[PDB]
Design an enzyme around this catalytic site. Sequence first.
Site, PDB file in Angstrom:
ATOM      1  N   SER A  46      -1.668   6.674  -2.215  1.00 59.26           N
ATOM      2  CA  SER A  46      -2.297   5.459  -2.750  1.00 59.26           C
ATOM      3  C   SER A  46      -1.567   4.171  -2.373  1.00 59.26           C
ATOM      4  CB  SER A  46      -2.405   5.559  -4.274  1.00 59.26           C
ATOM      5  OG  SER A  46      -3.190   6.693  -4.651  1.00 59.26           O
ATOM      6  N   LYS A  49      -3.362   1.729  -0.031  1.00 59.46           N
ATOM      7  CA  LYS A  49      -4.279   0.673  -0.474  1.00 59.46           C
ATOM      8  C   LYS A  49      -3.792  -0.722  -0.097  1.00 59.46           C
ATOM      9  CE  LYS A  49      -6.575   2.647  -4.513  1.00 59.46           C
ATOM     10  NZ  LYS A  49      -6.031   4.025  -4.400  1.00 59.46           N
ATOM     11  N   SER A  93      -6.080   1.995  -9.200  1.00 60.39           N
ATOM     12  CA  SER A  93      -5.913   2.913  -8.071  1.00 60.39           C
ATOM     13  C   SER A  93      -7.168   3.748  -7.818  1.00 60.39           C
ATOM     14  CB  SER A  93      -4.691   3.799  -8.264  1.00 60.39           C
ATOM     15  OG  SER A  93      -3.685   3.370  -7.363  1.00 60.39           O
ATOM     16  N   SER A 184       1.920   2.433  -7.311  1.00 53.23           N
ATOM     17  CA  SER A 184       2.350   3.816  -7.403  1.00 53.23           C
ATOM     18  C   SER A 184       1.469   4.679  -6.512  1.00 53.23           C
ATOM     19  CB  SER A 184       2.295   4.315  -8.847  1.00 53.23           C
ATOM     20  OG  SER A 184       0.953   4.525  -9.235  1.00 53.23           O
ATOM     21  N   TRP A 186       0.659   9.163  -5.804  1.00 54.32           N
ATOM     22  CA  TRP A 186       0.973  10.576  -6.005  1.00 54.32           C
ATOM     23  C   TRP A 186       0.066  11.348  -5.055  1.00 54.32           C
ATOM     24  CZ3 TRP A 186       1.595  13.321 -11.432  1.00 54.32           C
ATOM     25  CH2 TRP A 186       1.880  14.679 -11.217  1.00 54.32           C
ATOM     26  N   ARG A 226       7.734   7.817 -12.578  1.00 58.74           N
ATOM     27  CA  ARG A 226       8.042   7.006 -11.402  1.00 58.74           C
ATOM     28  C   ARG A 226       8.285   5.546 -11.777  1.00 58.74           C
ATOM     29  NH1 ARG A 226       2.626   8.092  -9.006  1.00 58.74           N
ATOM     30  NH2 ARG A 226       2.362   8.800 -11.170  1.00 58.74           N
TER      31      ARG A 226
HETATM   32  C1  LIG Z   1      -2.750   7.963  -5.122  1.00 58.04           C
HETATM   33  O1  LIG Z   1      -1.699   8.133  -4.514  1.00 58.04           O
HETATM   34  C2  LIG Z   1      -3.296   9.071  -5.995  1.00 58.04           C
HETATM   35  C3  LIG Z   1      -4.473   9.737  -5.240  1.00 58.04           C
HETATM   36  C4  LIG Z   1      -5.748  10.093  -5.996  1.00 58.04           C
HETATM   37  O2  LIG Z   1      -4.782   8.983  -4.056  1.00 58.04           O
HETATM   38  C5  LIG Z   1      -3.428   8.539  -7.429  1.00 58.04           C
HETATM   39  C6  LIG Z   1      -4.428   7.383  -7.593  1.00 58.04           C
HETATM   40  C7  LIG Z   1      -3.649   9.658  -8.465  1.00 58.04           C
HETATM   41  C8  LIG Z   1      -2.535   9.433  -9.453  1.00 58.04           C
HETATM   42  S1  LIG Z   1      -2.350  10.266 -10.899  1.00 58.04           S
HETATM   43  C9  LIG Z   1      -3.590  11.505 -11.176  1.00 58.04           C
HETATM   44  C10 LIG Z   1      -4.986  10.907 -11.272  1.00 58.04           C
HETATM   45  N1  LIG Z   1      -5.203  10.630 -12.699  1.00 58.04           N
HETATM   46  C11 LIG Z   1      -4.527  11.711 -13.440  1.00 58.04           C
HETATM   47  C12 LIG Z   1      -4.084  11.234 -14.805  1.00 58.04           C
HETATM   48  O3  LIG Z   1      -3.810  10.058 -15.003  1.00 58.04           O
HETATM   49  N2  LIG Z   1      -4.020  12.145 -15.782  1.00 58.04           N
HETATM   50  C13 LIG Z   1      -3.273  11.897 -17.009  1.00 58.04           C
HETATM   51  C14 LIG Z   1      -4.682  13.444 -15.707  1.00 58.04           C
HETATM   52  C15 LIG Z   1      -3.360  12.135 -12.547  1.00 58.04           C
HETATM   53  C16 LIG Z   1      -1.724   8.481  -9.003  1.00 58.04           C
HETATM   54  C17 LIG Z   1      -0.538   7.956  -9.645  1.00 58.04           C
HETATM   55  O4  LIG Z   1       0.140   7.198  -8.932  1.00 58.04           O
HETATM   56  O5  LIG Z   1      -0.215   8.250 -10.821  1.00 58.04           O
HETATM   57  N3  LIG Z   1      -2.120   8.028  -7.818  1.00 58.04           N
END
Ligand SMILES: *C(=O)[C@H]([C@@H](C)O)[C@@]1(C)CC(S[C@@H]2CN[C@H](C(=O)N(C)C)C2)=C(C(=O)O)N1
Length: 243
Positions: A46, A49, A93, A184, A186, A226
């Site tokens: 992410s 972006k 995000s 951020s 993930w 993080r």
């Molecule tokens: C970006 O790096 C990542 C992917 C989808 O491109 C992204 C946007 C996902 C997450 S966290 C993940 C999505 N929502 C879940 C959540 O919040 N819960 C509690 C289930 C987990 C991130 C991140 O940086 O946290 N980035």
Amino acid sequence: SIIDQNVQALFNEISADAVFVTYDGQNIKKYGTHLDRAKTAYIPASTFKIANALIGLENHKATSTEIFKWDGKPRFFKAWDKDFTLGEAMQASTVPVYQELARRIGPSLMQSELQRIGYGNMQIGTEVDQFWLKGPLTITPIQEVKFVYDLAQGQLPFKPEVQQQVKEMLYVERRGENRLYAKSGWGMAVDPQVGWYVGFVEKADGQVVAFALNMQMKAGDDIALRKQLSLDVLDKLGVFHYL
Ligand SMILES: *C(=O)[C@H]([C@@H](C)O)[C@@]1(C)CC(S[C@@H]2CN[C@H](C(=O)N(C)C)C2)=C(C(=O)O)N1
């Protein structure tokens, strides 16, 4: 010094492989439990972006005012099922919005632009809305921190108004006149998963300290770690004190 030791002691309770890179325009500094992460390339996830918004605004594929309307298809996350500006989608995000932006850019332009600015290994593969999520685009933490440092200074090879628009999409908080910007990430689609917290602190001084946390993630990890670990580090460094 002791502040170096203060920072390392924070990571001695982090069991995951993590590096934290800082850049002040002169010196790269590295902390954490596995310092070689700083020169290892991972998928941007992410954090891409940032480059996506820049490329798309620069090439008249969106504005910062345009609404990216939800098309009615329930997305992975539910809180994504609404309309978004690019800036609102940066803070949420919202991947489907930025995938739609990548599709407006197209593979040809996207490729030439990543080459033009030298972002990571500049490799997009064959799917224009997936390459920062699955590979083959990868970038080292040191490349990220230098990328966003230049963004902070308006010195990336883009229009200054475009850099200013994307820069403010990353605004997180201020303490006095010190400003934190951050994004951020993930990446869960790769093995091992990669976690990012990249950004910069703009002092009233005008001096900038850019930073990149980069760490191994695994399923079930705390999504807040993080950001909280990076703010702890920035505080121990004296770059961004808690109030
Ligand atoms: C970006 O790096 C990542 C992917 C989808 O491109 C992204 C946007 C996902 C997450 S966290 C993940 C999505 N929502 C879940 C959540 O919040 N819960 C509690 C289930 C987990 C991130 C991140 O940086 O946290 N980035």
